[PDB]
């Protein structure tokens, strides 16, 4: 029926409705650190989020998205392996039912408790909907979360989750600064891949940061309280909303560091 993360509609079944699921440039992947090529021609990333305007937080039934005003160049990513400017449209997370799983990308097969994705679209395409149809349409920053100390900048998000508990609920969410979600270092790995949920389009330049951020146990515990279902439907906790690692195929992972 419609895709999700259960036993009957889970990632193993997606190919039946989205044949691109078995494509040549599918994400996520395992990052083999000893095989990644250091590329000294990669520039440092440029993150300009000082003019970011968050607007709303929504439970879409598969994750929660915080959405930003992308009608102008307010929060952009450039540099790194990118050509052109990419505007932040939304961020969301992937997490697990236990601390030992939850991330989509893995490092030398190590899984993290969660993974943050900051989604940006290439301005040359005029809108998000046009950008997903292009090989260089999106740039996604992936950030791993490990359980340790609390991340102060994530608490505003944690606190509003009670109000978007079930699918379709949304809440006003203004004045949130995504700078509070970045690690100290911007060292990264990069490769060409896709969206990790249907429609699985192969339009993404992935930028995965080497340094994880820490969250407390209680912070991630609040994520696990969300629901996949709509209000008044039987309760299914929103956990394990992560796609397993896909074959690298003909692709090289490049590192911005050695």
78 binds Zn ion (CB under 5 A): no
Nearest residue to Zn ion on Cβ basis: 117
- Residue (39 or 224) nearer to Zn ion, CB: 224
Pick the stretch among 115-123, 175-183, 203-211, 238-246 that binds Zn ion (CB under 5 A): 115-123
62 binds Zn ion (CB under 5 A): no
- Residue (103 or 227) nearer to Zn ion, CB: 103
| Cβ pair 128, 88 in contact under 8 A | no
Query: Among the options 2, 15, 62, 105, which is catalytic?
Result: 62
94 known member of a binding site: yes
174 known member of a binding site: no
Pick the stretch among 41-49, 176-184, 190-198, 208-216 that binds Zn ion (CB under 5 A): 190-198
In the range 193-232, which residues lie near Zn ion by CB under 5 A? Answer: 196
62 catalytic, yes or no? yes
92 known member of a binding site: yes
Pick the stretch among 81-89, 113-121, 235-243, 246-254 that binds Zn ion (CB under 5 A): 113-121
State how far the Cα of 167 lies from the Cα of 63, in Å rounded to an integer: 9
117 binds Zn ion (CB under 5 A): yes
The CB-of-17 to Zn ion minimum distance in angstroms stands at 19
Count of residues near Zn ion by CB under 5 A: 2
Q: Residues annotated as binding site for substrate? A: 196-197
Q: Give catalytic residues, as residue numbers.
A: 62
Binding residues for Zn ion, rule: CB under 5 A, are 117, 196
Q: Residues annotated as binding site? A: 92, 94, 117, 196-197
């Amino acid at each position: 029926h419609h895709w999700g993360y259960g036993k009957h509609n889970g990632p193993e079944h997606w190919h039946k409705d989205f044949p691109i699921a078995k494509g040549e440039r599918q994400s996520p992947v395992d990052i083999d650190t000893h095989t990644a090529k250091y590329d000294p021609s990669l520039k440092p990333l440029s993150v300009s989020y000082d003019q970011a305007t968050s607007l709303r937080i929504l439970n879409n039934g598969h994750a929660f998205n915080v959405e930003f005003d992308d009608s102008q160049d307010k929060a952009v990513l450039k540099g790194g392996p990118l050509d052109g400017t990419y505007r932040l449209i939304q961020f969301h997370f992937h997490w697990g039912s236990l601390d030992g799983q939850g991330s989509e990308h893995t490092v030398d097969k190590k899984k993290y408790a969660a993974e943050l994705h900051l989604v940006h679209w290439n301005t040359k395409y005029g809108d998000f909907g046009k950008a997903v149809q292009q090989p260089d349409g999106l740039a996604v920053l992936g950030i791993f979360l490990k359980v340790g100390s609390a991340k102060p900048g994530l608490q505003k998000v944690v606190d509003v989750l009670d109000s978007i508990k079930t699918k379709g609920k949304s809440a006003d969410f203004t004045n949130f600064d995504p700078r509070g979600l970045l690690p100290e270092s911007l060292d990264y790995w990069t490769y060409p891949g896709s969206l990790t949920t249907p429609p699985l389009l192969e339009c993404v330049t992935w930028i995965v940061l080497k340094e994880p951020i820490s969250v407390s146990s209680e912070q991630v515990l609040k994520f696990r309280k969300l629901n996949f279902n709509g209000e008044g439907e039987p309760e299914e906790l929103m956990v394990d909303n992560w796609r397993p690692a896909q074959p690298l195929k003909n692709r090289q992972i490049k590192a911005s560091f050695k």
